[PDB]
Design a protein around this ligand. Structure first.
Ligand SMILES: [Cu+]
Ligand SMILES: [Cu+]
Ligand SMILES: [Cu+]
Ligand SMILES: [Cu+]
Ligand SMILES: [Cu+]
Ligand SMILES: [Cu+]
Ligand SMILES: [Cu+]
Ligand SMILES: [Cu+]
Length: 36
């Protein structure tokens, strides 16, 4: 999905901007699954 994360790993990360698997509201790296 379109990426609307505010975590450090994803915010302005071009790799997952249009291919993000995170839960909505994924705002913390500690619980971020992106690219798992
Ligand atoms: Cu995302
Ligand atoms: Cu991401
Ligand atoms: Cu993330
Ligand atoms: Cu992302
Ligand atoms: Cu993601
Ligand atoms: Cu994310
Ligand atoms: Cu996130
Ligand atoms: Cu995430």
């Amino acid at each position: 999905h379109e990426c609307q994360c505010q975590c450090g790993s994803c915010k302005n990360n071009e790799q997952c901007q249009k291919s993000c698997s995170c839960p909505t509201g994924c705002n913390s790296d500690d619980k971020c699954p992106c690219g798992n």
